[PDB]
RNA sequence: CUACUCGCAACUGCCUAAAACUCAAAGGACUUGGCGGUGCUUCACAUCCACCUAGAGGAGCCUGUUCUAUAAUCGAUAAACCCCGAUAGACCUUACCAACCCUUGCCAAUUCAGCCUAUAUACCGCCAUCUUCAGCAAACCCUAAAAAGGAACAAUAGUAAGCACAAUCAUAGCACAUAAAAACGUUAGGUCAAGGUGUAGCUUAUGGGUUGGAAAGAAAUGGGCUACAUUUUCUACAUAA
RNA sequence: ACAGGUUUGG
């Protein structure tokens, strides 16, 4: 049995996001990529750079923002600055929040030699798709 | 059946007799009891399988306006109705058997799904059905095509009269003032 | 949820009010045909699943329909069978009965009066008409259906197909009746044109186990082949392939009759001879009649071959060979 | 004929030693056992053995004697149409005998009634 | 398998279209086969409407044929077909009038012909009762009495020949043992036919 | 079906027949799983046989195991292991050993790090198997009570969201095939050695570095390559030499 | 006795 980034049944109470009640071969099919950039192409280069730097923003933004984070983040690369997408919910008041952004968007783009761009959208509850 | 030695005249070399006079009487208090339901806007369901007249069943039915049910009876169909046919829906006022006795010799689900949700049931009780349960039996055959094709004449015209009455008696209310 | 369903009505009108306006085009004039190019273009979701890219449709699309009302404002319900669980199924099975009957009755009294003025209408084999499936049964009937109901309700339909139906009873049997899809399988035939004083000329294409090939044939000169500048002798030294070649002519009598130059590029020495095989019976298709097509299309001529090769898998060696499974 | 049960069974009613120790109650079940795997005879021998009377008697030639070898393939090619065109004549007819598949239906729509 | 159900058989014979009007019951199914709009196959690449090739042919070049290499069996056959010929040309022209009204040239002929010497009429198969297995005389097919009389040619010409003697020259040879009824063919097939004989008194056995 | 008594042509006996002590159970039927070295039936479209093709067991070589032999890794090791971890070993890899060095010894700091130490019979993450088998299942209804069961298509109490199947998707046009997918669970199946880990153990060592060796075959075996030829070998060459 | 606890997968 597969149980690569799958979720499995419970007895039909658990809240699942629309991300993870789609199995891993339905990527590029009824789900899309989390993170965008050029390394992944044929003729192109720097797939670990990249890499590397997505996997340490997953952590860093997931600590940064605890419990407050729905989903994954949406990693945007596109002309030498890299967005940020965040579901975030309205846990914090809107002071922290605007603290947070402010020290993220400057900490991350001295620390990686690069613009940065965050996003914040607040949701009342994490939205189910399946049964809940 | 053991229920049917107060309603049998006697027996001719095996084969029982039923006694008109009672048959004749409750036939009477049965065609009574048919017509003021259907006078009174009842929902009159006649449910019977037998796959003889299922035809002749559900044309009577569409000649009277009323219901009819000759297919596979289904189990909760009476008693969770609220799951079968619709959210909130009208259960039959009157239930009208002219075969108590299915495909498998037994008697059927809905002559004690009527008596287990308060439904009044008006059946043809043959030698061998049991009329413990319903309301008003009338100890007949229901095997021959002369008699299911005159209980079924016979329920024609007490529910054609009834109705008729009732819209005179509507048009004559409509006069009163 | 009506008022749900007209909240979702209203939004989607503004929200297509403001997509015309951001578009540029006439609101009064715009309609579903520039919604869904306007979404796809602004959206450019590229997944494999059309049904999960962004979708705008009116909420009647949207949200799906159920079964109407049954029963009026004094619960009577409307159809006569309401209480049989299927008031559609046993409402149709009961009126076929009716016909079937009807049919019956009346056959019966031309044969006490001694007419036989009808015929047997089964035999459908030149119109291809079968019956229809649960999915087209469940698509006419909205309630669902069961696989014994199903096959009960075309053992009824053929029984009443095997008696001799009536004027409206044929129609009223054809009606569940679903032919080919298009029916006309026959190819088309491409015009005869005429290029640089070139009388008889025609072009066709083929292909088999990725090989593509194209001829230029003309059929007022001589019986010859031109593959890729080179004699087809020289080009095909195997008796096999100059039999693919031969093959769509013999059967044509087109021996001597056509000057033929033919292109092949991808395959081996018999994907390029099936693959010229096959363009040049689709090119001499313009030359012979309606029959003489049909003949070649099933002889084989006009189809292609979709036997190609299949992806090795995993573990495996061809496909099919799996390794030497020790049992001990 | 049916032998006789009465007296036969313990019951209270019965004064005499029970006869009959039935295994298990004696009531007729509503679907008939499975036939266990129905088979048939080979055919042709006949034939077969008037073919190889030719072999043996002309030294094993068929040069010799043809008809024994006509005759033989006819039977063959017979009795290959007849295993093909009956297996569903047979399942479609109910004239002699009948598989339990259609026994079980058949005793189903008239069941006995243990009850009431 | 990538023709599904609806996919019929070819029709590569020429004359069963070129007369449509000489016959009303081969026209009944003609004028309904493609109104049906059935799917037919693609026509192999093996099989063509040529006069000059067989069937039976191509079933033995197939059955001859190692692996995938179709030119090597192709030309095998060839060379086999020349050399019949030629020997049987020989034979001709070495002798008289009188044999040259008898004996035949036609390779093909000569072929078909030891091909239905060297067809078997019974067969044995082994059945499986008490726990031994019992080989029970049994009619066999036209198709698995043809396939047997061609593999056993073929195994005998494979392994029952020098290193210096070439597979047409040999087989050449063979055709013309069987076409005579003198081959060690036709002694396998006498030898298949008396152990079924020896073996009758088992038909008792079969249940087809 | 015991000792003590009475009686008996019985004398290893028969009839009658206790008590001390131990325990809070001992018992009959029933419902559901599990099991059966007791049965019957069903088919497998590479599957069991009737049958077809090409292979291993014969030779050599490569490679992986079980063994002897050393100071010299380990796990897997019936279907579901054996060119498996490893799509990769002269040092590094390498967790093995022998000789020598360092002990807040990667981080800003931590009476702190670090352990390829044990536990895969505590795990997650990842999978093998039945397995292209289809079943699982909240909310109702029924049973002369309900532990539980719920089916007869010429139909006898069964409806049902969603998860499986199916459909859809990918092999750039259909169909087909392939691919992909295959829930709940069995094998206390494999992985503490991809990685983090609860518990139990190391801290002048089971930790951190340098150098040198990690053989070899008495013997058996799995899987592949070369062939044992004439449909063969060599030469130029698309295949007429 | 107006009773309750205690056998068993139940
Ligand atoms: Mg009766
Ligand atoms: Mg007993
Ligand atoms: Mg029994
Ligand atoms: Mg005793
Ligand atoms: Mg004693
Ligand atoms: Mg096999
Ligand atoms: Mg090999
Ligand atoms: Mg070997
Ligand atoms: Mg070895
Ligand atoms: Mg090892
Ligand atoms: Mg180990
Ligand atoms: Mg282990
Ligand atoms: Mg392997
Ligand atoms: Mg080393
Ligand atoms: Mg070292
Ligand atoms: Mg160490
Ligand atoms: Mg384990
Ligand atoms: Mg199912
Ligand atoms: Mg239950
Ligand atoms: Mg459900
Ligand atoms: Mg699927
Ligand atoms: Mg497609
Ligand atoms: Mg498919
Ligand atoms: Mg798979
Ligand atoms: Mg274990
Ligand atoms: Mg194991
Ligand atoms: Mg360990
Ligand atoms: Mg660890
Ligand atoms: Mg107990």
């Not at chain 3, 046993?90 to 009294?109: A, R």
């Not at chain 3, 491409?190 to 008889?200: H, K, V």
Request: charged residues 30%; hydrophobic residues 35%; aromatic residues 10%.
């Amino acid at each position: 049995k597969n149980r690569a980034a799958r979720v499995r049944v419970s007895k039909g109470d658990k809240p699942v996001t629309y991300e993870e009640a789609h199995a891993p071969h339905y990527i590029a099919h009824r789900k899309g990529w989390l993170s965008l950039h050029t390394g992944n192409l044929d003729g192109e280069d720097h797939a670990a750079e990249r890499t590397v730097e997505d996997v340490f923003l997953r952590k860093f933004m997931l600590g940064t923002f605890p419990g407050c984070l729905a989903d994954q983040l949406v990693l945007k690369r596109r002309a030498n600055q890299l967005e940020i997408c965040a579901l975030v919910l309205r846990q914090l008041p809107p002071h922290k929040f605007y603290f947070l952004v402010g020290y993220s968007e400057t900490l991350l783009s001295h620390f990686y030699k690069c613009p940065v761009h965050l996003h914040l959208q607040t949701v009342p509850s994490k939205v189910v798709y399946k049964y809940i | 059946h053991r229920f049917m030695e107060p309603y049998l005249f006697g027996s001719r070399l095996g084969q029982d007799i039923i006694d008109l006079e009672q048959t004749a009487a409750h036939l009477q208090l049965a065609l009574n009891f048919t017509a003021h339901v259907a006078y009174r806007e009842g929902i009159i369901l006649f449910v019977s399988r037998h796959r003889q007249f299922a035809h002749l069943i559900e044309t009577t039915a569409r000649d009277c306006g009323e219901y009819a049910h000759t297919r596979y009876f289904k189990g909760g169909l009476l008693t969770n109705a609220p799951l079968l046919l619709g959210p909130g829906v009208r259960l039959p006022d009157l239930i009208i058997f002219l075969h108590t006795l299915n495909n498998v010799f037994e008697p059927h689900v809905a002559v004690r799904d009527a008596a287990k949700m308060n439904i009044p049931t008006v059946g043809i009780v043959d030698t061998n059905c049991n009329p413990a349960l319903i309301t008003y039996p009338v100890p007949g055959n229901d095997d021959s095509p002369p008699a299911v094709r005159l209980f079924c004449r016979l329920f024609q015209v007490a529910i054609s009269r009834a109705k008729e009455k009732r819209r005179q008696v509507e048009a004559l209310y409509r006069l009163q003032g | 949820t009506v008022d749900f369903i007209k909240k979702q009505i209203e939004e989607f009108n503004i929200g297509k009010r403001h997509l015309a306006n951001m578009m540029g085009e006439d609101p009064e004039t715009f309609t579903q045909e520039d919604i869904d190019r306007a979404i796809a273009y602004l959206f450019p979701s590229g997944l494999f699943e059309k049904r999960a890219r962004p979708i705008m449709k009116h909420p009647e699309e949207i949200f799906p329909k159920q079964r109407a009302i049954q029963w009026g404002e004094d619960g009577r319900p409307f159809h006569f069978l309401f209480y049989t669980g299927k008031q559609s199924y046993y409402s149709l099975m009961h009126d076929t009965y009716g016909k079937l009957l009807d049919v019956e009755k009346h056959h019966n009294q031309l044969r006490a009066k001694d007419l036989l003025a009808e015929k047997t209408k089964i035999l459908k084999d030149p119109i291809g008409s079968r019956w229809l499936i649960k999915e087209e049964l469940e698509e006419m009937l909205v309630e669902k259906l069961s696989d014994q109901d199903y096959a009960q309700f075309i053992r009824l339909l053929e029984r009443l197909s095997a008696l001799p139906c009536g004027a409206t009873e044929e129609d009223f049997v054809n009606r569940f009746r679903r032919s080919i899809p298009i029916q006309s399988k026959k190819q088309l035939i491409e015009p005869l044109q005429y290029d640089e004083q070139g009388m008889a000329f025609s072009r066709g294409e083929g292909k088999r186990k990725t090989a593509k090939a194209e001829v230029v044939v003309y059929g007022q000169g001589s019986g010859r082949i031109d593959v890729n500048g080179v004699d087809y002798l020289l080009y095909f030294p195997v008796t096999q392939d100059r039999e693919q070649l031969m093959f769509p002519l013999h059967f044509l009598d087109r021996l001597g009759k056509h000057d033929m130059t033919c292109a092949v590029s991808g395959g081996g020495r018999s994907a390029q001879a099936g693959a010229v095989r096959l363009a040049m019976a689709r090119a001499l298709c313009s030359f012979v009649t309606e029959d003489e097509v049909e003949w070649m299309r099933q002889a084989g001529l006009l189809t292609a071959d979709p036997r190609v090769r299949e992806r090795k898998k995993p573990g495996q060696e061809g496909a099919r060979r799996k390794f030497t499974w020790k049992k001990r | 004929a049916t032998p006789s049960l009465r007296g036969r069974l313990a019951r209270l009613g019965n004064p005499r030693r029970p006869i009959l120790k039935p295994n298990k109650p004696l009531i007729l079940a509503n679907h008939v056992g499975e036939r266990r795997r129905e088979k048939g005879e080979a055919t042709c021998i006949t034939e077969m053995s008037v073919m190889m009377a030719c072999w043996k008697q002309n030294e094993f030639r068929d040069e010799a004697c043809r008809k024994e070898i006509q005759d033989f393939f006819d039977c063959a090619s017979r009795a290959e149409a007849a295993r093909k065109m009956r297996s569903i004549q047979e399942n479609l007819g109910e004239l002699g005998s009948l598989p339990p598949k259609k026994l079980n239906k058949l005793l189903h729509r008239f069941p006995n009634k243990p009850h009431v | 398998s990538r023709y599904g159900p609806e996919y019929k058989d070819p029709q590569i014979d020429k004359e069963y279209y070129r007369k449509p009007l000489a016959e009303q019951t081969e026209e009944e199914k003609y004028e309904r086969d493609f109104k049906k709009t059935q799917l037919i196959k693609a026509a192999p690449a093996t099989k063509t409407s040529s006069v000059f090739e067989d069937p039976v042919i191509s079933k033995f070049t197939n059955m001859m044929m190692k692996g995938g290499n179709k030119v090597l069996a192709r030309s095998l056959m060839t060379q086999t077909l020349e050399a019949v010929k030629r020997k049987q040309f020989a034979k001709y022209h070495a002798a008289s009038a009188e044999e040259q009204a008898t004996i035949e040239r036609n390779p093909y002929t000569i072929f078909h012909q030891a091909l239905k010497n060297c067809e078997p009429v019974i067969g044995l198969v082994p059945i499986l009762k008490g726990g031994h297995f019992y080989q029970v005389p049994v009619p066999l097919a036209d198709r698995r009495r043809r396939f047997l009389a061609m593999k056993w040619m073929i195994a005998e010409c494979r392994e029952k020949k020098h290193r210096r003697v070439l597979m047409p020259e040999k087989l050449s040879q063979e055709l013309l043992e069987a076409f005579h009824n003198q081959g060690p063919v036709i002694k396998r097939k006498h030898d298949m036919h008396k152990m079924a004989e020896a073996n009758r008194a088992l038909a008792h056995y079969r249940w087809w």
